[PDB]
Amino acid sequence: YSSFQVMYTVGYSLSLAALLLALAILGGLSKLHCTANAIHANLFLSFVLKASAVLFIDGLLRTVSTWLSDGAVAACRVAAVFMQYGIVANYCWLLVEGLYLHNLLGLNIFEMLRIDEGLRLKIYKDYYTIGIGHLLTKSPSLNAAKSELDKAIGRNTNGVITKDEAEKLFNQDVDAAVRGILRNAKLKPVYDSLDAVRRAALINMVFQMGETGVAGFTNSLRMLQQKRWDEAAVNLAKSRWYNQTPNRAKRVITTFRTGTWDAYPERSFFSLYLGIGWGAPALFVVPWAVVKCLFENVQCWTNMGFWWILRFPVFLAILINFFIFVRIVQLLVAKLRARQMHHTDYAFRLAKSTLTLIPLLGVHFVVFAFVTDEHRSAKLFFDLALSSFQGLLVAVLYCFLNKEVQSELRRRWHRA
Ligand SMILES: COc1ccc2cc(-c3cc(-c4cc(Cl)cc(Cl)c4)nn3[C@@H](C)c3ccc(C(=O)NCCC(=O)O)cc3)ccc2c1
Ligand SMILES: CCCCCCCC/C=C\CCCCCCCC(=O)O
Ligand SMILES: CCCCCCCC/C=C\CCCCCCCC(=O)O
Ligand SMILES: CCCCCCCC/C=C\CCCCCCCC(=O)O
Numbered sequence: 001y002s003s004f005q006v007m008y009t010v011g012y013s014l015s016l017a018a019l020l021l022a023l024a025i026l027g028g029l030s031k032l033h034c035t036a037n038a039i040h041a042n043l044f045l046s047f048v049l050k051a052s053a054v055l056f057i058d059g060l061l062r063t064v065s066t067w068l069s070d071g072a073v074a075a076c077r078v079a080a081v082f083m084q085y086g087i088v089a090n091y092c093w094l095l096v097e098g099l100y101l102h103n104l105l106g107l108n109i110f111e112m113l114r115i116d117e118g119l120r121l122k123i124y125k126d127y128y129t130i131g132i133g134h135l136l137t138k139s140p141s142l143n144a145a146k147s148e149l150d151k152a153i154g155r156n157t158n159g160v161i162t163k164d165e166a167e168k169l170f171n172q173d174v175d176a177a178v179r180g181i182l183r184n185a186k187l188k189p190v191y192d193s194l195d196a197v198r199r200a201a202l203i204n205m206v207f208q209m210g211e212t213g214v215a216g217f218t219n220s221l222r223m224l225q226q227k228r229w230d231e232a233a234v235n236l237a238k239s240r241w242y243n244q245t246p247n248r249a250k251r252v253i254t255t256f257r258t259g260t261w262d263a264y265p266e267r268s269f270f271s272l273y274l275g276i277g278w279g280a281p282a283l284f285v286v287p288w289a290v291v292k293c294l295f296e297n298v299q300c301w302t303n304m305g306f307w308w309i310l311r312f313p314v315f316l317a318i319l320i321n322f323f324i325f326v327r328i329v330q331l332l333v334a335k336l337r338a339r340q341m342h343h344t345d346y347a348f349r350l351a352k353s354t355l356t357l358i359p360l361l362g363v364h365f366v367v368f369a370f371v372t373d374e375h376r377s378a379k380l381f382f383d384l385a386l387s388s389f390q391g392l393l394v395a396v397l398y399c400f401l402n403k404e405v406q407s408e409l410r411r412r413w414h415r416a
Contacts, residue, residue: 004381011388012051018392022399035262040398043093047391050086053079065299076300088281091317098324105331107261109200123159131166180211201255233257284313318362353397
């Protein structure tokens, strides 16, 4: 146990140093402020909580529990709760990581317009409109709109259509928008000198206000053509288009400003991530801390530390992760086959870390769960020794090896 104690001490302390360093890096570099890095930071924090609790409990008990004093039992129990909380939070944030990557892979111009326009199988005022944001006519007459709809679909729809017909209209409208940009003299050079995400951001506006409607922001076009994203964002915020549809304009403007899909899907969607990563563990850990304090309030509530009963929420988090994992793979090979992306892409590089971490941590937890119930000490010491380094592994995979992080570090180094 002496060697085992030394090994997990080195593992958790090294993990803690690396995690605090990674947190200082993500927090201190403003250009790295994306949703993915906020998720990584919260994951880092959960491991920081775990490692801090482990090192503290270890200092209090192994540097016994039958005769602990009033302050000792208190600090020890608080540390035990924080340890359990950190352990469940690890897997819940790995789950959030899988969710974010999965949603990121599904994002494109199609999904973006699909979020900003929705899908209405019946005609509605936006001007009469149906399907996914498809204009019918600006004429007040309802029959005049229904006529254009029935003519466009080639049948008596009576103002009601199917989803297949709607998306069929959708693909055409996207094609027409892109051709409208390419034919335009004042829009094409701007579109050519743009990354795929911002190109989609321009196509959004063309899909909403037509070709000439976006052509009318030439003073705002030259700015993003000059890569002055900030002032372009401000001037776009000043525009009448912002006053008419602020909620959509914010997402598009931030898509121009950040060059990321972070605006999508929706604002405060991150609160769900917070609820899963921090709240969900609280839902299971708090009541069981209550049961511990009420009925098993002995020693330090000290399975090698982790509470037995808490397996199952983690199991749940792992189970869901499995289905996410599979889906992600299916998207990846799809995007690679269609050449919609390649290995230098951010989604792929994120997948390199997340798709290793999910099976690694999941299989490790399942193995731990089976071994702890065998009533085996060798397998426990080995797996826990290696598991102590997991915070270091996460910090390395999500931060230190990250291309944007290293690029920013090289840039700040080169500026000097
Ligand atoms: C697309 O699907 C997937 C899924 C899993 C994948 C897993 C690996 C892989 C190969 C190896 C390995 C290990 C040894 Cl000892 C020797 C040799 Cl020769 C190779 N490690 N790993 C993992 C451990 C890994 C390595 C780097 C990064 C990274 O660089 N992240 C940061 C990227 C960034 O942000 O720029 C993240 C994981 C590679 C592609 C993958 C692709
Ligand atoms: C018990 C301690 C652990 C619980 C602490 C939880 C408190 C919230 C912590 C971090 C909040 C992170 C919010 C960051 C928003 C960034 C959004 C973005 O960049 O897209
Ligand atoms: C300081 C870097 C910036 C990031 C801030 C993250 C918030 C820090 C949260 C907890 C810090 C505790 C780490 C030290 C624990 C030591 C445990 C021990 O000495 O036994
Ligand atoms: C007792 C509760 C058990 C819960 C089990 C959960 C099983 C399903 C969990 C996650 C499923 C997510 C699959 C994502 C498919 C998205 C489709 C797409 O990518 O377009």
